[PDB]
Symmetry: C2
Subunit: 215 residues, 2 copies
């Protein structure tokens, strides 16, 4: 299981928080226009994430593994407000109207990112599917903390219900990463090489997505 350490090293060496977009974020050096383009363009992935999870679940005969995947899917989509609801709240807190959001056309970078996730989640390796999701979710707790700080320090976010997306979990997200790590081991079928390849593609794809909001 040293491939799990290789997996974490890939992610550490290509981590979203070292991307220029989030370095600028941490300094307040982002325009309203930039934050608005980012929140709108991210919606596609936010809406797709439940499908990444059900994609893997639908191909899985490990009953305990399915329960862990279902747990995450419920966290994402069950109830009101769900994750998609909370993301919309953050979009509207930035000045985008409900109709600007629904009218937005996802960029090519956003579509390529979502396609990278779905390719792994519908592929022939369950472990590599989970590894694709882990390569994203394992970054989220740290990102959420930094994003919350920038939002209150530089971008004028006083009403804490306005960044509830980054808050109402930031804990569930720690749990998701831990359970995904265990899922990778439960579902491994001599395909550690695919686990690592999924991580490389996902981390690069996330960088390409963040690249699109800089000049």
């Amino acid at each position: 299981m040293n491939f799990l350490d290789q997996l974490d090293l890939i992610i550490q060496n290509k981590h979203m928080l070292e991307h220029t977009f989030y370095v600028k974020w941490s300094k307040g050096e982002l325009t309203k226009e930039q934050l608005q383009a980012y929140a709108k363009d991210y919606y596609l992935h936010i809406k797709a994430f439940p499908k990444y999870l059900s994609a893997i679940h639908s191909r899985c005969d490990d009953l305990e593994a399915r329960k862990l995947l279902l747990d995450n899917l419920m966290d994402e989509e069950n109830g009101y407000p769900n994750h998609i609801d909370l993301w919309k709240q953050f979009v509207f807190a930035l000045g985008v109207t409900p109709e600007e959001l629904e009218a937005h056309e996802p960029s090519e970078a956003a579509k390529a990112k979502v396609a990278t996730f779905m390719r792994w989640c519908t592929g022939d390796s369950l472990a590599a599917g989970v590894a694709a999701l882990y390569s994203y979710e394992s970054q989220i707790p740290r990102i959420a903390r930094e994003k919350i700080r920038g939002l209150t320090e530089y971008f004028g976010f006083s009403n804490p219900e306005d960044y509830a997306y980054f808050t109402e979990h930031e804990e569930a997200d720690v749990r998701h990463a831990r359970e995904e790590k265990a899922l990778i081991e439960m579902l491994l079928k001599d395909d550690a090489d695919k686990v690592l390849e999924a991580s490389q593609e996902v981390t690069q794809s996330l960088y390409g997505f963040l690249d699109s909001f800089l000049d």
Copy 2:
């Protein structure tokens, strides 16, 4: 309207008119036939959450996904879930957990599950739901009959032994209603595939029940 034709396909090839359940409702099944049925059904019971997630994973209608997730949660979330409750019914028939695990699904069982998965992973969301509806819309009536047969002929006096049929079928009425709404929500001028799915599902179920005679 294709929904009425759909309901007529199901009414006219209904599991409760199959010889197996005809014999069930008279007590004319042996303890050995029951145990074979209960063990062979386990493949389908375990697979059912995957039918729902397969459709969900191909769906961008956010409201439709929530209804599919509701059914999936009903099936698999919590303890005891549906699968645990089926095991309870199996073991109440005299089968050991070792025998249940060791059981190899028949070809008729595998064929029935492959029919469901063929539609749920296919290119028509509405026809995937219609395949599930062609089964689930039958279950409230079937659950009622089976409960009668179990208590009246096969010695079930502890209601916990047939909890699979009770603690949910009441939710299965809701599932059929919601799946009928889902078929409409997701229709993409593929009513013909909706009907094709129902023909295959109703017949696959007859083939499955055929195998116990």
